[PDB]
PDB file of C-alpha atoms and ligand atoms in Angstrom:
ATOM      1  CA  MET A   1     -18.173   1.250  -4.682  1.00  0.00           C
ATOM      2  CA  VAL A   2     -17.215   3.471  -7.767  1.00  0.00           C
ATOM      3  CA  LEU A   3     -15.178   7.093  -6.855  1.00  0.00           C
ATOM      4  CA  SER A   4     -16.784  10.186  -8.755  1.00  0.00           C
ATOM      5  CA  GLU A   5     -13.828  12.412 -11.771  1.00  0.00           C
ATOM      6  CA  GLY A   6     -13.786  14.966  -8.285  1.00  0.00           C
ATOM      7  CA  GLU A   7     -12.902  11.622  -6.012  1.00  0.00           C
ATOM      8  CA  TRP A   8     -10.304  10.628  -8.549  1.00  0.00           C
ATOM      9  CA  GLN A   9      -9.478  14.551  -9.431  1.00  0.00           C
ATOM     10  CA  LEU A  10      -7.895  14.314  -5.658  1.00  0.00           C
ATOM     11  CA  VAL A  11      -6.861  11.103  -4.698  1.00  0.00           C
ATOM     12  CA  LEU A  12      -4.440  11.880  -8.442  1.00  0.00           C
ATOM     13  CA  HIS A  13      -3.233  15.486  -7.403  1.00  0.00           C
ATOM     14  CA  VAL A  14      -1.618  14.068  -4.703  1.00  0.00           C
ATOM     15  CA  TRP A  15      -0.160  10.793  -5.951  1.00  0.00           C
ATOM     16  CA  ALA A  16       1.146  12.734  -7.694  1.00  0.00           C
ATOM     17  CA  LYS A  17       3.280  14.590  -5.410  1.00  0.00           C
ATOM     18  CA  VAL A  18       4.186  11.280  -4.080  1.00  0.00           C
ATOM     19  CA  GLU A  19       5.349  10.417  -7.339  1.00  0.00           C
ATOM     20  CA  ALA A  20       7.947  13.169  -7.143  1.00  0.00           C
ATOM     21  CA  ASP A  21       9.675  11.236  -4.581  1.00  0.00           C
ATOM     22  CA  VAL A  22       8.905   6.928  -4.633  1.00  0.00           C
ATOM     23  CA  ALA A  23      11.986   5.684  -2.854  1.00  0.00           C
ATOM     24  CA  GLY A  24      11.367   8.161   0.516  1.00  0.00           C
ATOM     25  CA  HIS A  25       7.347   7.805   0.511  1.00  0.00           C
ATOM     26  CA  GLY A  26       8.761   4.253  -0.076  1.00  0.00           C
ATOM     27  CA  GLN A  27      10.229   3.691   3.170  1.00  0.00           C
ATOM     28  CA  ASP A  28       8.708   6.237   5.671  1.00  0.00           C
ATOM     29  CA  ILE A  29       5.853   3.897   4.619  1.00  0.00           C
ATOM     30  CA  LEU A  30       6.933   1.129   4.848  1.00  0.00           C
ATOM     31  CA  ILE A  31       8.790   2.115   8.160  1.00  0.00           C
ATOM     32  CA  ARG A  32       5.235   3.197   9.770  1.00  0.00           C
ATOM     33  CA  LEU A  33       3.614   0.543   8.887  1.00  0.00           C
ATOM     34  CA  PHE A  34       6.414  -1.287  10.867  1.00  0.00           C
ATOM     35  CA  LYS A  35       6.647   0.974  13.714  1.00  0.00           C
ATOM     36  CA  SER A  36       2.973   0.872  14.201  1.00  0.00           C
ATOM     37  CA  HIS A  37       2.677  -3.269  13.809  1.00  0.00           C
ATOM     38  CA  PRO A  38       5.115  -5.212  13.780  1.00  0.00           C
ATOM     39  CA  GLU A  39       3.946  -8.734  12.948  1.00  0.00           C
ATOM     40  CA  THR A  40       3.741  -7.452   9.804  1.00  0.00           C
ATOM     41  CA  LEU A  41       7.597  -7.957   9.091  1.00  0.00           C
ATOM     42  CA  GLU A  42       8.025 -10.850  10.112  1.00  0.00           C
ATOM     43  CA  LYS A  43       6.352 -11.628   6.567  1.00  0.00           C
ATOM     44  CA  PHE A  44       9.112  -9.721   4.855  1.00  0.00           C
ATOM     45  CA  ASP A  45      12.201 -12.987   5.041  1.00  0.00           C
ATOM     46  CA  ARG A  46      14.136 -11.357   2.805  1.00  0.00           C
ATOM     47  CA  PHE A  47      14.996  -7.663   6.090  1.00  0.00           C
ATOM     48  CA  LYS A  48      12.298  -9.609   9.523  1.00  0.00           C
ATOM     49  CA  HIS A  49      15.640  -8.911  11.042  1.00  0.00           C
ATOM     50  CA  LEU A  50      15.886  -4.842  11.106  1.00  0.00           C
ATOM     51  CA  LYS A  51      15.477  -4.264  15.149  1.00  0.00           C
ATOM     52  CA  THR A  52      15.790  -0.689  14.976  1.00  0.00           C
ATOM     53  CA  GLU A  53      14.595   2.491  12.082  1.00  0.00           C
ATOM     54  CA  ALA A  54      17.587   3.435  11.729  1.00  0.00           C
ATOM     55  CA  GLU A  55      18.466  -0.124  10.897  1.00  0.00           C
ATOM     56  CA  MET A  56      15.771  -0.132   8.515  1.00  0.00           C
ATOM     57  CA  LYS A  57      16.552   3.597   7.064  1.00  0.00           C
ATOM     58  CA  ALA A  58      19.433   2.816   6.516  1.00  0.00           C
ATOM     59  CA  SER A  59      18.183  -0.636   4.159  1.00  0.00           C
ATOM     60  CA  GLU A  60      18.140  -0.974   0.830  1.00  0.00           C
ATOM     61  CA  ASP A  61      16.169  -4.449   0.630  1.00  0.00           C
ATOM     62  CA  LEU A  62      13.359  -1.646   2.667  1.00  0.00           C
ATOM     63  CA  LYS A  63      13.494   0.666   0.166  1.00  0.00           C
ATOM     64  CA  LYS A  64      13.791  -1.464  -2.914  1.00  0.00           C
ATOM     65  CA  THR A  65      10.593  -3.097  -1.847  1.00  0.00           C
ATOM     66  CA  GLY A  66       8.751   0.207  -0.767  1.00  0.00           C
ATOM     67  CA  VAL A  67       9.250   1.647  -4.915  1.00  0.00           C
ATOM     68  CA  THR A  68       7.570  -1.914  -6.172  1.00  0.00           C
ATOM     69  CA  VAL A  69       4.956  -1.461  -3.521  1.00  0.00           C
ATOM     70  CA  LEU A  70       3.463   2.460  -4.633  1.00  0.00           C
ATOM     71  CA  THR A  71       5.116   1.804  -8.390  1.00  0.00           C
ATOM     72  CA  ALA A  72       2.133  -1.275  -8.346  1.00  0.00           C
ATOM     73  CA  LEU A  73      -0.137   1.136  -5.898  1.00  0.00           C
ATOM     74  CA  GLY A  74       0.408   4.443  -8.696  1.00  0.00           C
ATOM     75  CA  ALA A  75      -0.123   2.203 -11.284  1.00  0.00           C
ATOM     76  CA  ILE A  76      -3.746   0.994 -10.463  1.00  0.00           C
ATOM     77  CA  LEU A  77      -4.540   4.068  -8.859  1.00  0.00           C
ATOM     78  CA  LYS A  78      -4.296   5.559 -11.961  1.00  0.00           C
ATOM     79  CA  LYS A  79      -6.444   2.994 -13.871  1.00  0.00           C
ATOM     80  CA  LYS A  80      -9.509   4.586 -11.776  1.00  0.00           C
ATOM     81  CA  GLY A  81     -11.241   1.733 -10.615  1.00  0.00           C
ATOM     82  CA  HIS A  82     -10.794   0.028 -14.087  1.00  0.00           C
ATOM     83  CA  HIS A  83      -7.678  -2.353 -12.557  1.00  0.00           C
ATOM     84  CA  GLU A  84      -9.201  -5.512 -12.982  1.00  0.00           C
ATOM     85  CA  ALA A  85      -6.140  -6.770 -15.182  1.00  0.00           C
ATOM     86  CA  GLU A  86      -3.345  -4.971 -12.954  1.00  0.00           C
ATOM     87  CA  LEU A  87      -5.205  -6.574  -9.657  1.00  0.00           C
ATOM     88  CA  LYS A  88      -5.103 -10.592 -11.093  1.00  0.00           C
ATOM     89  CA  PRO A  89      -1.247 -11.397 -10.298  1.00  0.00           C
ATOM     90  CA  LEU A  90      -1.041  -9.231  -7.167  1.00  0.00           C
ATOM     91  CA  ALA A  91      -4.185 -10.570  -5.537  1.00  0.00           C
ATOM     92  CA  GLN A  92      -2.550 -14.809  -6.425  1.00  0.00           C
ATOM     93  CA  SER A  93       1.146 -13.353  -4.962  1.00  0.00           C
ATOM     94  CA  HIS A  94      -0.352 -12.106  -1.881  1.00  0.00           C
ATOM     95  CA  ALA A  95      -2.683 -14.996  -1.733  1.00  0.00           C
ATOM     96  CA  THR A  96      -0.860 -17.727  -2.703  1.00  0.00           C
ATOM     97  CA  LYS A  97       3.052 -17.063  -2.076  1.00  0.00           C
ATOM     98  CA  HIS A  98       3.304 -13.884   0.146  1.00  0.00           C
ATOM     99  CA  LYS A  99       0.276 -14.684   2.758  1.00  0.00           C
ATOM    100  CA  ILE A 100      -0.678 -11.621   3.460  1.00  0.00           C
ATOM    101  CA  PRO A 101      -4.293 -11.012   5.553  1.00  0.00           C
ATOM    102  CA  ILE A 102      -7.151  -8.660   4.559  1.00  0.00           C
ATOM    103  CA  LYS A 103      -5.920  -6.992   7.956  1.00  0.00           C
ATOM    104  CA  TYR A 104      -2.614  -6.294   6.706  1.00  0.00           C
ATOM    105  CA  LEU A 105      -3.548  -4.112   3.930  1.00  0.00           C
ATOM    106  CA  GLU A 106      -5.186  -2.494   6.033  1.00  0.00           C
ATOM    107  CA  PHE A 107      -2.601  -1.754   8.139  1.00  0.00           C
ATOM    108  CA  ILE A 108       0.066  -0.257   5.309  1.00  0.00           C
ATOM    109  CA  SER A 109      -2.939   1.651   3.411  1.00  0.00           C
ATOM    110  CA  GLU A 110      -3.490   3.748   7.621  1.00  0.00           C
ATOM    111  CA  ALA A 111       0.382   3.892   7.122  1.00  0.00           C
ATOM    112  CA  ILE A 112      -0.591   5.195   3.973  1.00  0.00           C
ATOM    113  CA  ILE A 113      -3.228   8.190   4.521  1.00  0.00           C
ATOM    114  CA  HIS A 114      -0.533   8.907   7.836  1.00  0.00           C
ATOM    115  CA  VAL A 115       2.228   9.996   5.830  1.00  0.00           C
ATOM    116  CA  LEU A 116       0.107  11.324   3.569  1.00  0.00           C
ATOM    117  CA  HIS A 117      -0.890  13.925   5.832  1.00  0.00           C
ATOM    118  CA  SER A 118       2.081  14.684   7.387  1.00  0.00           C
ATOM    119  CA  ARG A 119       4.187  15.066   4.574  1.00  0.00           C
ATOM    120  CA  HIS A 120       1.640  16.462   2.202  1.00  0.00           C
ATOM    121  CA  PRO A 121      -1.177  19.131   4.912  1.00  0.00           C
ATOM    122  CA  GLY A 122      -2.016  21.199   2.009  1.00  0.00           C
ATOM    123  CA  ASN A 123      -3.022  18.832  -0.545  1.00  0.00           C
ATOM    124  CA  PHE A 124      -4.473  16.595   1.880  1.00  0.00           C
ATOM    125  CA  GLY A 125      -7.185  17.393   3.945  1.00  0.00           C
ATOM    126  CA  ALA A 126     -10.185  16.344   4.912  1.00  0.00           C
ATOM    127  CA  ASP A 127     -11.769  16.280   1.225  1.00  0.00           C
ATOM    128  CA  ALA A 128      -8.636  14.527  -0.532  1.00  0.00           C
ATOM    129  CA  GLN A 129      -8.371  11.988   2.593  1.00  0.00           C
ATOM    130  CA  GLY A 130     -11.592  11.424   2.409  1.00  0.00           C
ATOM    131  CA  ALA A 131     -10.987  10.536  -1.281  1.00  0.00           C
ATOM    132  CA  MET A 132      -7.845   8.643  -1.154  1.00  0.00           C
ATOM    133  CA  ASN A 133      -9.112   6.400   1.760  1.00  0.00           C
ATOM    134  CA  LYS A 134     -12.797   5.326  -0.408  1.00  0.00           C
ATOM    135  CA  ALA A 135      -9.714   4.752  -2.918  1.00  0.00           C
ATOM    136  CA  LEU A 136      -8.483   2.087  -0.766  1.00  0.00           C
ATOM    137  CA  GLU A 137     -11.274   0.257   0.050  1.00  0.00           C
ATOM    138  CA  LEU A 138     -12.512  -0.350  -3.564  1.00  0.00           C
ATOM    139  CA  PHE A 139      -8.640  -1.438  -3.589  1.00  0.00           C
ATOM    140  CA  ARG A 140      -9.201  -3.540  -0.252  1.00  0.00           C
ATOM    141  CA  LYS A 141     -12.476  -4.128  -1.332  1.00  0.00           C
ATOM    142  CA  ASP A 142     -11.989  -5.952  -5.099  1.00  0.00           C
ATOM    143  CA  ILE A 143      -8.731  -7.663  -3.130  1.00  0.00           C
ATOM    144  CA  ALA A 144     -10.490  -9.678  -0.720  1.00  0.00           C
ATOM    145  CA  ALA A 145     -12.507 -10.575  -3.485  1.00  0.00           C
ATOM    146  CA  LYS A 146     -10.528 -12.855  -5.761  1.00  0.00           C
ATOM    147  CA  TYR A 147      -8.421 -13.948  -2.861  1.00  0.00           C
ATOM    148  CA  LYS A 148     -12.257 -15.411  -2.475  1.00  0.00           C
ATOM    149  CA  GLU A 149     -11.602 -16.619  -6.315  1.00  0.00           C
ATOM    150  CA  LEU A 150      -8.798 -18.005  -5.784  1.00  0.00           C
ATOM    151  CA  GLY A 151      -8.875 -20.393  -2.360  1.00  0.00           C
ATOM    152  CA  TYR A 152      -7.390 -17.818   0.422  1.00  0.00           C
ATOM    153  CA  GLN A 153     -10.686 -14.898   1.976  1.00  0.00           C
ATOM    154  CA  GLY A 154      -7.854 -14.097   4.226  1.00  0.00           C
TER     155      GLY A 154
HETATM  156  C1  LIG B 201      -0.758  -1.500  -1.931  1.00  0.00           C
HETATM  157  C2  LIG B 201      -1.142  -2.581  -1.417  1.00  0.00           C
HETATM  158  C3  LIG B 201       0.515  -3.678  -1.233  1.00  0.00           C
HETATM  159  C4  LIG B 201       1.007  -4.037  -2.733  1.00  0.00           C
HETATM  160  C5  LIG B 201       1.182  -2.967  -4.443  1.00  0.00           C
HETATM  161  C6  LIG B 201       1.946  -4.292  -2.977  1.00  0.00           C
HETATM  162  C7  LIG B 201       2.525  -4.784  -3.855  1.00  0.00           C
HETATM  163  C8  LIG B 201       3.675  -5.452  -4.461  1.00  0.00           C
HETATM  164  C9  LIG B 201       4.498  -5.968  -5.298  1.00  0.00           C
HETATM  165  C10 LIG B 201       4.306  -5.337  -6.453  1.00  0.00           C
HETATM  166  C11 LIG B 201       5.299  -6.996  -5.469  1.00  0.00           C
HETATM  167  C12 LIG B 201       6.408  -7.773  -6.346  1.00  0.00           C
HETATM  168  C13 LIG B 201       5.264  -8.496  -7.208  1.00  0.00           C
HETATM  169  C14 LIG B 201       5.119 -10.155  -6.256  1.00  0.00           C
HETATM  170  O1  LIG B 201       5.396 -10.618  -5.396  1.00  0.00           O
HETATM  171  O2  LIG B 201       3.842  -9.610  -6.683  1.00  0.00           O
HETATM  172  C15 LIG B 201       5.212  -7.709  -4.008  1.00  0.00           C
HETATM  173  C16 LIG B 201       6.056  -8.718  -2.918  1.00  0.00           C
HETATM  174  C17 LIG B 201       6.232  -8.433  -2.032  1.00  0.00           C
HETATM  175  N1  LIG B 201       4.408  -8.087  -1.234  1.00  0.00           N
HETATM  176 FE1  LIG B 201       3.763  -6.627  -1.346  1.00  0.00          FE
HETATM  177  N2  LIG B 201       1.953  -5.276  -2.493  1.00  0.00           N
HETATM  178  C18 LIG B 201       0.938  -4.541  -0.948  1.00  0.00           C
HETATM  179  C19 LIG B 201       0.472  -4.650  -0.258  1.00  0.00           C
HETATM  180  C20 LIG B 201       1.772  -5.972   0.785  1.00  0.00           C
HETATM  181  C21 LIG B 201       1.452  -6.105   2.520  1.00  0.00           C
HETATM  182  C22 LIG B 201      -0.019  -5.527   3.660  1.00  0.00           C
HETATM  183  C23 LIG B 201       2.120  -6.607   2.673  1.00  0.00           C
HETATM  184  C24 LIG B 201       3.518  -7.962   4.198  1.00  0.00           C
HETATM  185  C25 LIG B 201       2.642  -7.272   5.330  1.00  0.00           C
HETATM  186  C26 LIG B 201       3.149  -7.427   1.663  1.00  0.00           C
HETATM  187  C27 LIG B 201       4.020  -8.372   1.636  1.00  0.00           C
HETATM  188  C28 LIG B 201       5.255  -8.617   0.772  1.00  0.00           C
HETATM  189  C29 LIG B 201       6.245  -9.683   0.559  1.00  0.00           C
HETATM  190  C30 LIG B 201       6.817 -10.311   1.047  1.00  0.00           C
HETATM  191  C31 LIG B 201       6.497  -9.510  -0.502  1.00  0.00           C
HETATM  192  C32 LIG B 201       7.745 -10.810  -1.744  1.00  0.00           C
HETATM  193  C33 LIG B 201       9.091  -9.257  -1.195  1.00  0.00           C
HETATM  194  C34 LIG B 201      10.495 -10.013  -1.461  1.00  0.00           C
HETATM  195  O3  LIG B 201      11.119 -10.932  -1.075  1.00  0.00           O
HETATM  196  O4  LIG B 201      10.491  -9.216  -3.148  1.00  0.00           O
HETATM  197  N3  LIG B 201       2.702  -6.340   1.175  1.00  0.00           N
HETATM  198  N4  LIG B 201       4.046  -6.408  -3.527  1.00  0.00           N
END
């Protein structure tokens, strides 16, 4: 697939607002993912034991992780589709080391779209959400193809 420059603009315009607070958005998104799909918390051996949202809010490990996730995603979106190199190492560790199914990447994409919609309503109207969903679908499709080459397709 291929996004038009206007769609990338909508994606990078709302991403520039997320970057004013990467750690807060990281927390919100991971907590949204774990409350919606609790089985995903099991993949994180570091803080798998957290039982409540309050615990999750108070975990420094969860917040650091959230910042790592968003910083790597932001670096991929800024490429505007030319992300082959950034995707390689990512696809390898999530397919071989962590074992994250494509389904989980769909779940976090939905958590990203839910948080942006709540926090940024004025910059996340319907066209901007369609462009963000396209950009995340592109990311999932290229990662899924890399998973296949690596022998995981999951
Ligand atoms: C937008 C999608 C994602 C991006 C950009 C992303 C990126 C990263 C990055 C950069 C790291 C550190 C380096 C590495 O291990 O590769 C990481 C580690 C990890 N990611 Fe992901 N991730 C994403 C989705 C997920 C999902 C959905 C899960 C789990 C349901 C997951 C589980 C993990 C785990 C278990 C680690 C190790 C955490 C720790 O112990 O350090 N990731 N991820």
